[PDB]
Amino acid sequence: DVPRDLEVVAATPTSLLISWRGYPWATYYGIIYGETGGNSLVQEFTMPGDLSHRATISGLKPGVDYTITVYAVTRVGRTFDTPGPISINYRTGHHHH
Amino acid sequence: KVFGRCELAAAMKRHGLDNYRGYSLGNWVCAAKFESNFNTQATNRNTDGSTDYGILQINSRWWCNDGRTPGSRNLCNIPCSALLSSDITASVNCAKKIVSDGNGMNAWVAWRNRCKGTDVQAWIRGCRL
């Protein structure tokens, strides 16, 4: 397959397990997600030293399309090759009931 | 205050940072060199509104409180101003809490790209201790 620098690897109707590509000068990573075309977004951050490059986004609505963005937080003057924000789209599945 | 290299090695060894969580003393000398250049008053902005303070560049979103970072956790429970003192006692105690948080010294970007996997003992070669 073609490499995917941001992807969902596990999903439930109300939760998503995203995986992304890390970079050496990243202090940590910021995760922005919200309904595609929605009026509000949520931002969270990973912890320093966490090199797992994985995170769980939870509390989502079933059957709704979300825009997930991951970017590397760096120190000013210590960014170098850090590419910047990458985004994907993912529509959650319906619930069993 | 800008520490000397050997001066800082002895000060951090007095604080018991040698082999703390398996990290020999040379790791901490090298980490301070590429994070702050041995300057106790080093301050650097991040791109998320946070700031790194002190000789070990302790982050103001996760560890210390600087009163200006949104959603700061302050897991070290200490004002960031205390990490700008010429006395590195506060920065060492917070560094021990960070390295024991399960990720080791990988929390310091400069240590990862400049010290990890190198001859870190070169940074203590020729010092008193």
Short mmCIF file of C-alpha atoms in Angstrom, two decimals:
data_model
loop_
_atom_site.label_atom_id
_atom_site.label_comp_id
_atom_site.label_asym_id
_atom_site.label_seq_id
_atom_site.Cartn_x
_atom_site.Cartn_y
_atom_site.Cartn_z
CA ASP A 1 0.00 0.00 0.00
CA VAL A 2 0.91 3.67 -0.28
CA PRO A 3 2.16 5.01 3.09
CA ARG A 4 -0.52 6.86 5.07
CA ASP A 5 0.86 9.53 7.41
CA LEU A 6 -2.52 9.77 9.19
CA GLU A 7 -5.13 7.03 9.38
CA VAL A 8 -7.81 5.42 11.51
CA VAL A 9 -6.77 1.90 12.51
CA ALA A 10 -9.65 0.99 14.87
CA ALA A 11 -13.13 2.45 15.13
CA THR A 12 -16.47 2.24 16.94
CA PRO A 13 -19.63 4.26 16.20
CA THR A 14 -18.57 6.74 18.92
CA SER A 15 -14.76 6.43 19.06
CA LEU A 16 -11.74 6.47 16.75
CA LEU A 17 -8.17 5.20 17.15
CA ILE A 18 -5.97 7.35 14.90
CA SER A 19 -2.33 6.71 14.00
CA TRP A 20 0.06 9.22 12.44
CA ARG A 21 3.66 9.67 11.32
CA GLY A 22 6.05 11.19 13.86
CA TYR A 23 8.94 13.60 13.39
CA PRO A 24 12.15 14.02 15.40
CA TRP A 25 11.82 17.66 16.52
CA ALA A 26 8.20 17.39 17.70
CA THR A 27 7.78 18.23 21.38
CA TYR A 28 4.30 16.66 21.24
CA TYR A 29 1.34 16.63 18.85
CA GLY A 30 -1.94 18.52 18.66
CA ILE A 31 -5.14 16.73 17.63
CA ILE A 32 -7.97 18.80 16.14
CA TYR A 33 -11.27 17.13 15.29
CA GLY A 34 -14.81 18.23 14.53
CA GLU A 35 -17.76 17.55 12.28
CA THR A 36 -16.87 18.31 8.67
CA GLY A 37 -18.40 21.70 8.00
CA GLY A 38 -19.40 22.04 11.65
CA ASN A 39 -19.35 25.18 13.75
CA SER A 40 -16.96 24.03 16.49
CA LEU A 41 -13.81 21.93 16.80
CA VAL A 42 -11.97 20.30 19.71
CA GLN A 43 -8.20 20.42 20.24
CA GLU A 44 -6.12 18.10 22.43
CA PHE A 45 -2.40 17.45 22.90
CA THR A 46 -0.26 14.38 23.47
CA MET A 47 2.32 14.21 26.20
CA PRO A 48 6.06 14.84 25.75
CA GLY A 49 8.06 11.65 25.31
CA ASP A 50 5.02 9.76 24.00
CA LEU A 51 6.46 8.33 20.78
CA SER A 52 3.63 5.83 20.19
CA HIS A 53 2.11 8.12 17.52
CA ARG A 54 -1.38 6.89 18.44
CA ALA A 55 -4.39 8.44 20.15
CA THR A 56 -8.05 7.66 20.81
CA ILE A 57 -10.73 10.22 19.92
CA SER A 58 -13.92 9.39 21.81
CA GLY A 59 -17.40 10.77 22.37
CA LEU A 60 -18.21 11.09 18.66
CA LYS A 61 -21.62 10.90 17.06
CA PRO A 62 -22.56 7.88 14.92
CA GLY A 63 -23.02 8.43 11.20
CA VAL A 64 -21.29 11.83 11.28
CA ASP A 65 -18.32 12.80 9.12
CA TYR A 66 -15.38 14.19 11.07
CA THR A 67 -12.23 16.06 10.02
CA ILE A 68 -9.16 14.95 11.99
CA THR A 69 -5.99 17.07 11.91
CA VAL A 70 -2.64 16.23 13.52
CA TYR A 71 0.27 18.67 13.74
CA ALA A 72 3.61 18.65 15.52
CA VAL A 73 4.17 21.25 18.24
CA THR A 74 7.74 22.54 18.08
CA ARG A 75 9.91 25.13 19.79
CA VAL A 76 10.26 28.43 17.96
CA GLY A 77 13.63 28.31 16.25
CA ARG A 78 13.74 24.50 16.48
CA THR A 79 11.25 23.41 13.80
CA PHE A 80 13.55 22.52 10.84
CA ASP A 81 11.86 19.99 8.49
CA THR A 82 8.62 19.60 10.49
CA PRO A 83 5.98 19.37 7.71
CA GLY A 84 2.98 20.76 9.58
CA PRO A 85 -0.68 19.82 9.84
CA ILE A 86 -2.05 16.82 7.96
CA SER A 87 -5.76 16.03 7.77
CA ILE A 88 -8.10 13.13 6.99
CA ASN A 89 -11.86 12.59 6.90
CA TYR A 90 -13.76 9.75 8.56
CA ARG A 91 -17.51 9.11 8.79
CA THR A 92 -18.36 7.04 11.87
CA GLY A 93 -20.59 4.01 11.56
CA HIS A 94 -24.14 3.70 12.79
CA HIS A 95 -24.86 2.27 16.23
CA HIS A 96 -26.11 -1.26 16.77
CA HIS A 97 -29.44 -0.31 18.36
CA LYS B 1 23.27 32.09 35.66
CA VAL B 2 25.21 30.12 33.04
CA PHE B 3 26.64 26.98 34.64
CA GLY B 4 29.99 25.52 33.76
CA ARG B 5 29.88 22.00 32.37
CA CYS B 6 31.78 20.38 35.26
CA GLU B 7 30.05 22.70 37.75
CA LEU B 8 26.65 21.44 36.58
CA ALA B 9 27.77 17.80 36.62
CA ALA B 10 28.70 18.02 40.31
CA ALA B 11 25.51 19.91 41.19
CA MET B 12 23.26 17.35 39.51
CA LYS B 13 25.23 14.46 41.01
CA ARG B 14 24.65 16.02 44.43
CA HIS B 15 20.93 15.90 43.58
CA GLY B 16 21.22 12.17 42.81
CA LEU B 17 20.56 12.30 39.06
CA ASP B 18 23.23 9.66 38.35
CA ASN B 19 21.51 6.41 37.27
CA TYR B 20 18.14 7.85 38.31
CA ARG B 21 15.72 5.54 36.47
CA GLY B 22 18.69 4.03 34.65
CA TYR B 23 19.97 7.30 33.16
CA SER B 24 23.64 7.93 33.97
CA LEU B 25 24.72 11.41 35.03
CA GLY B 26 26.23 12.22 31.62
CA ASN B 27 22.76 12.11 30.06
CA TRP B 28 21.58 15.06 32.16
CA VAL B 29 24.68 17.18 31.48
CA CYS B 30 24.28 16.58 27.74
CA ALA B 31 20.53 17.24 27.93
CA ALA B 32 21.01 20.65 29.56
CA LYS B 33 23.70 21.54 27.01
CA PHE B 34 21.45 21.14 23.98
CA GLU B 35 18.22 22.29 25.66
CA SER B 36 19.42 25.49 27.35
CA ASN B 37 23.21 25.72 26.80
CA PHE B 38 23.66 25.49 30.60
CA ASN B 39 21.65 28.71 31.09
CA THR B 40 19.33 28.64 34.11
CA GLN B 41 17.35 31.57 32.65
CA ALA B 42 16.62 30.06 29.23
CA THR B 43 13.07 30.66 27.96
CA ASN B 44 11.75 29.47 24.61
CA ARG B 45 8.28 29.77 23.10
CA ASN B 46 6.44 26.83 21.56
CA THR B 47 3.93 26.99 18.72
CA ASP B 48 0.98 26.07 21.00
CA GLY B 49 1.12 29.01 23.41
CA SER B 50 3.35 27.15 25.88
CA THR B 51 6.92 27.92 26.96
CA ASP B 52 9.96 25.93 28.12
CA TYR B 53 11.68 27.31 31.22
CA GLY B 54 15.01 26.81 32.93
CA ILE B 55 18.20 24.87 32.42
CA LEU B 56 16.17 21.76 31.48
CA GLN B 57 13.50 23.62 29.44
CA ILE B 58 10.50 22.44 31.44
CA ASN B 59 7.26 22.82 29.49
CA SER B 60 4.46 25.10 30.74
CA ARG B 61 1.56 23.06 29.32
CA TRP B 62 2.34 19.79 31.11
CA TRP B 63 4.70 20.41 34.04
CA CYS B 64 4.82 23.95 35.46
CA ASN B 65 2.35 26.84 35.61
CA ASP B 66 3.22 30.14 33.93
CA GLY B 67 -0.30 31.63 34.06
CA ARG B 68 -0.55 32.10 30.28
CA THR B 69 -0.80 28.61 28.71
CA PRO B 70 -4.34 27.34 27.98
CA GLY B 71 -5.19 23.96 29.46
CA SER B 72 -1.97 23.70 31.46
CA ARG B 73 -1.90 20.62 33.68
CA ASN B 74 0.98 21.58 36.02
CA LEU B 75 1.79 17.96 36.83
CA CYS B 76 4.93 19.08 38.69
CA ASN B 77 2.79 21.50 40.79
CA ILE B 78 5.29 24.36 40.72
CA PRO B 79 5.33 27.87 39.19
CA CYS B 80 7.53 28.11 36.11
CA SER B 81 9.27 31.10 37.68
CA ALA B 82 10.75 28.72 40.27
CA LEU B 83 12.43 26.88 37.39
CA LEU B 84 14.27 30.08 36.38
CA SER B 85 16.21 30.25 39.66
CA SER B 86 19.99 29.95 39.72
CA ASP B 87 19.39 27.05 42.13
CA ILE B 88 18.52 23.98 40.03
CA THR B 89 16.82 22.15 42.90
CA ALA B 90 13.33 22.83 41.53
CA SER B 91 14.27 21.92 37.95
CA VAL B 92 15.87 18.66 39.12
CA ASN B 93 12.88 17.58 41.22
CA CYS B 94 10.51 18.23 38.31
CA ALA B 95 12.89 16.41 35.94
CA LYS B 96 12.77 13.35 38.19
CA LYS B 97 8.96 13.41 38.10
CA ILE B 98 9.05 13.68 34.30
CA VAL B 99 11.51 10.83 33.70
CA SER B 100 9.48 8.61 36.06
CA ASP B 101 6.25 9.27 34.13
CA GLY B 102 6.89 6.14 32.04
CA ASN B 103 8.62 7.60 28.95
CA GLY B 104 12.10 8.20 30.37
CA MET B 105 14.22 11.05 29.03
CA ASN B 106 12.39 11.00 25.67
CA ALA B 107 10.43 14.03 26.93
CA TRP B 108 13.43 16.24 26.05
CA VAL B 109 13.68 16.75 22.29
CA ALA B 110 17.30 17.91 22.42
CA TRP B 111 18.33 14.81 24.39
CA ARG B 112 16.66 12.57 21.79
CA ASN B 113 18.41 14.10 18.77
CA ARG B 114 21.80 14.99 20.33
CA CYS B 115 22.50 12.76 23.37
CA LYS B 116 20.61 9.46 23.05
CA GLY B 117 22.92 6.74 21.76
CA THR B 118 26.09 8.85 22.05
CA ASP B 119 29.11 8.85 24.37
CA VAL B 120 27.32 10.84 27.06
CA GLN B 121 30.12 10.15 29.56
CA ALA B 122 32.32 12.49 27.50
CA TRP B 123 30.30 15.30 29.12
CA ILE B 124 31.65 14.30 32.55
CA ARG B 125 35.19 13.33 31.50
CA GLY B 126 37.72 15.47 33.35
CA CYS B 127 35.40 16.77 36.09
CA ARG B 128 35.69 16.49 39.86
CA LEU B 129 32.65 14.54 41.13
#
